[PDB]
């Protein structure tokens, strides 16, 4: 449109409209050139390939891509607070995206004739890497300028080698748009209908749903013997009632479980051995053992045991300024997922006991522990909580069948997620980088809390006690930090 | 009815991630400072391209009910009549019924084509589905069996059968 | 309504306790209702 006229304005804010929210975030970005405009085949033995568990095969591309998949992109800490204290549920509706006010720099002067190529994959033909919880998200604090992450993908492998079924994709084989300093790029997306995320905690447990004042008309076996001696066998039956709530009949049972190892934040209590990988729960696929992380949604711990956390069973976030390798416990934030204990078994405990034999006068009744339990009819469970820092959506693997597609790191499982957005630098070459702006807009649907609860709720609140710094704000050096992981589950419901 | 799927995935469940970008999630990398007594410590590291085993994933492979592994090299096979005794079966009203073909599972690991499941094949091999489906002759995975403490070391069991869990995908059997 | 552009979260009124003999603002074992504390109206903030 013009060299000396801007192609777009800056939109950051949220509108709370009735039953809906509209979030809009605009960021400043910079895209370099990757691999000297080349594709370069990557395998593990390139870096030395220690384990077959780590053995991979794939490529790297010159293209970049945008990832807005984390909640702190679209929600300020206050917007997050308004949403979680006031609402039982939410879910996305429409998506909106703009790429504008582009600039290209020859390495440093202005190149006004250079272009930037961008395309979205709306038939989902490329490997979709947006559901892998990678770094490179639009920064939470809108004044941060960020670097576009380099795109890459993996395909089939045997060891470091490829196979006959392995694939290779050329992103140049997709028609794309070319943008100069007056051009802009935009598109609109429509989320496919998903169930509302539950931003609430049950006020009742699955086993306490009974009337405490009344007996059941059901009976249970109270006594198998009259007393101590020989040949004391008898069958007694009692009424299940208030005084014994453990034996009563129930219509629904807690959800599935896959047991985790229990680790204490008090280091002396832990065993003095390298049990971090050896004791971990894993699943093996094609001879390769992959760790189970975070796994099925289960409560982190039992009442009175908050010092413990499941080894691979929780989402762990880094604090601002934390390093990449071998950081201390204080430097990370281990999320707590106890709201779900009402319907979900404790991650570090066995699902229960089963009878392992037939009793007789010659054999005692023997039971054994259920370490893992698949879906049974009558089970009810909560999905994993979503956080300000955590993932929004994921793509459901395209397969003959799936069960409860909701992803295991939290968020909204989608067969047609938001499409990936690829970008590059159009290229012996001139050293070159481009910058510009990005604005994203999402419409959210909200489920209002209609509770008749008499006493006041638990709310998320900023502490008033004096401190050196304001939480969710910059320090003296100008660094923005998020002091804690904020889940969405505060308000309560009846089970 | 749904379209029968007639394709082989070019990607595996464990290989979904972007090989060039580090995950923003931490895992527990080390539980001891060094060798010897009183070395307990807690160290965490970013999951990344170098270690692809420990990453977090949104989806896990489908259910499995293990089969006995029989080799096309007769000498390798055990010297006993284990065709019936070593078979995976289900019991219904007092009657044992063999599991045939059974849940759709990869017939063998990649790198061994001489093995096949005892009752698990129609000898047509399913190895194309080894991407999202575990191996009929292998364990589904390992499960922690206790609480480790200063006295007791961490322990793990084997999962021979695994029922449906939320977040599983699988391929059906081929026609 | 409040339209504040404040970035960080507000202070809210919430029930602080974890485990306790009586939930606040509810009957006791004798059936006696009670209001545990006096609650003010001022939590959200404005610019002066």
């Amino acid at each position, epitope marked *: 449109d013009g060299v000396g006229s801007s192609s777009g304005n800056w939109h950051c804010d949220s509108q709370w409209l009735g039953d809906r929210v509209i979030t809009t975030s605009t960021r400043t970005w910079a895209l370099p050139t990757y691999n000297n405009h080349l594709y370069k085949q990557i395998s593990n033995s390139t870096s030395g390939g220690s384990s077959n568990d780590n053995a991979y095969f794939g490529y790297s591309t010159p293209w970049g891509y945008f990832d807005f998949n984390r909640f702190h992109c679209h929600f300020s800490p206050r917007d997050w607070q308004r949403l979680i204290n006031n609402n039982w549920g939410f879910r996305p509706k429409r998506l909106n995206f703009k790429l504008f006010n582009i600039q290209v720099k020859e390495v440093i002067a202005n190149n006004l004739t250079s272009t930037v190529q961008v395309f979205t994959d709306s038939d989902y033909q490329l490997p979709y890497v947006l559901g892998s919880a990678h770094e490179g998200c639009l920064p939470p604090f809108p004044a941060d300028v960020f670097m576009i992450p380099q795109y890459g993908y993996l395909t089939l492998n045997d060891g470091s080698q490829a196979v006959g079924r392995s694939s290779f994709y050329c992103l140049e084989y997709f028609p794309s748009q070319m943008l100069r300093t007056g051009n802009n790029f935009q598109f609109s997306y429509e989320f496919e209908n998903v169930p509302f995320h539950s931003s609430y905690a049950h006020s009742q447990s699955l086993d306490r749903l009974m009337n405490p004042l009344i007996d059941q008309y059901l009976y249970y076996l109270s006594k198998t013997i009259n007393g101590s001696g020989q040949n004391q066998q008898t069958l007694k039956f009692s009424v299940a009632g208030p005084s014994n709530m453990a034996v009563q009949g129930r219509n629904y049972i807690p959800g599935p479980s896959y047991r985790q190892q229990r680790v204490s934040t008090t280091v*002396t209590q832990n065993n003095n051995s390298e049990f971090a990988w050896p004791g971990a729960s894993s699943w093996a696929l094609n001879g390769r053992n992959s760790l189970m992380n975070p796994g099925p949604a289960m409560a*982190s711990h039992k009442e009175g045991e908050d010092r413990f956390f499941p080894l691979s069973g929780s989402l762990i976030f880094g604090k601002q300024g934390t390093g990449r390798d071998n950081v201390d416990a204080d430097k990370v934030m281990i999320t707590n997922e106890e709201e779900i204990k009402t319907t979900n078994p404790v991650a570090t405990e066995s699902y229960g006991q089963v009878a392992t034999n037939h009793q007789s006068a010659q054999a005692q009744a023997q039971t054994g522990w259920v370490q893992n339990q698949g879906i049974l009819p009558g089970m009810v469970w909560q999905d994993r909580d979503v956080y300000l820092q955590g993932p929004i959506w994921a793509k459901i693997p395209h397969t003959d069948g799936n069960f409860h597609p909701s992803p295991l790191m939290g968020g909204f499982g989608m067969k047609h997620p938001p499409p990936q957005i690829l970008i590059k630098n159009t290229p012996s070459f001139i050293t070159q980088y481009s910058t510009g702006q990005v604005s994203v807009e999402i419409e959210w649907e909200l489920q209002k809390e209609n509770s008749k609860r008499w006493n006041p709720e638990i709310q998320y609140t900023s502490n008033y006690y004096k401190s050196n710094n304001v939480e969710f704000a910059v320090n003296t050096e100008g660094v923005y930090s998020e002091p804690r*992981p904020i889940g969405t589950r505060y308000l309560t419901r009846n089970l | 009815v749904p379209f029968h799927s007639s394709y082989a995935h070019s990607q595996s469940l464990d290989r979904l991630m972007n090989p060039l970008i580090d995950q923003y999630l931490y895992y527990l990398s080390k539980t001891i400072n*060094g060798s010897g007594q009183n070395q307990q410590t807690l160290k965490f590291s970013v999951a990344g391209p170098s270690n692809m085993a420990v990453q977090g994933r949104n989806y896990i492979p489908g259910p499995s009910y293990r089969q006995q592994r029989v080799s096309t090299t007769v000498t390798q096979n055990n010297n006993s009549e284990f065709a019936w005794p070593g078979a995976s079966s289900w019991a219904l009203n007092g009657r044992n019924s063999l599991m045939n073909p059974g849940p759709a599972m990869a017939s063998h690991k990649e790198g061994e084509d001489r093995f096949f499941p005892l009752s698990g094949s129609l000898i047509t091999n399913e190895e194309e589905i080894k991407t999202t489906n575990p191996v009929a002759t292998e364990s589904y995975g390992q499960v922690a069996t206790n609480h480790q403490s200063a006295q007791a070391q961490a322990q793990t069991g084997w999962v021979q059968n695994q029922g449906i869990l939320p977040g599983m995908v699988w391929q059906d059997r081929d026609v | 309504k409040e339209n504040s552009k404040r970035w960080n979260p507000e202070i809210q009124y919430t029930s602080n306790y*974890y485990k306790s003999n009586n939930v606040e603002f509810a009957v006791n074992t004798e059936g006696v209702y009670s209001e545990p504390r006096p609650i003010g109206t001022r939590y959200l903030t404005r610019n002066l």
Partner: antibody
Amino acid sequence: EVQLLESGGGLVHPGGSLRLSCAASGFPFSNFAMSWVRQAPGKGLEWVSTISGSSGSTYYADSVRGRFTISRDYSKNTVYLEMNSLRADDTAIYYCAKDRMITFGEVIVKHYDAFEIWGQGTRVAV
Amino acid sequence: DIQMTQSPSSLSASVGDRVTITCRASQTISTNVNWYQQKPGKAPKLLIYAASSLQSGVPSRFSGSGSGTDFTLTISSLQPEDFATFYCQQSYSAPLTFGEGTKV
């Protein structure tokens, strides 16, 4: 300010029971871990017990464990240290200390760091 | 159980001149050590936390250093207010442990 009033006082006969109270004021009671530190006559000061802000984690010293019990009442912002089956060496002046580290319920972390604000203390003779 | 041993048991020194006290822990506890002082008849007061960080009210003449096993509490510009029994504490793991103490 921040103010810690502990009075369990007492002179008891060995094997007897005593309950220390510490009335805390001026800070968010739930978000800080409260601990008891003990100092015998003419000796060094010895840590006894601590309790999480949410009271989900109570830590006892090795000599103390199984006898003393720490708890907190959220209605009166008071931390209790009931001790039973007391012994001669329990004679000392007990302190009530607030922790430096502020915590919340949404992260699993150790609840003890350093004792920021102490208290004048009471005497337990036995 | 982790043991903190504070090397000078008692000490006396001239005012204004540097004094240094150290304690050696039984294991690598990283930066978890803390420092306190107790005057006769008065409750203890926190000086240093997380090995070197000083408390808001503590004078800048106090400082601390070390990691792993070894930790030192250095006092430059000793003063008459500064004469008291001093302690080092581990914050690393429970049960928590105080040093033997140093009367200065």
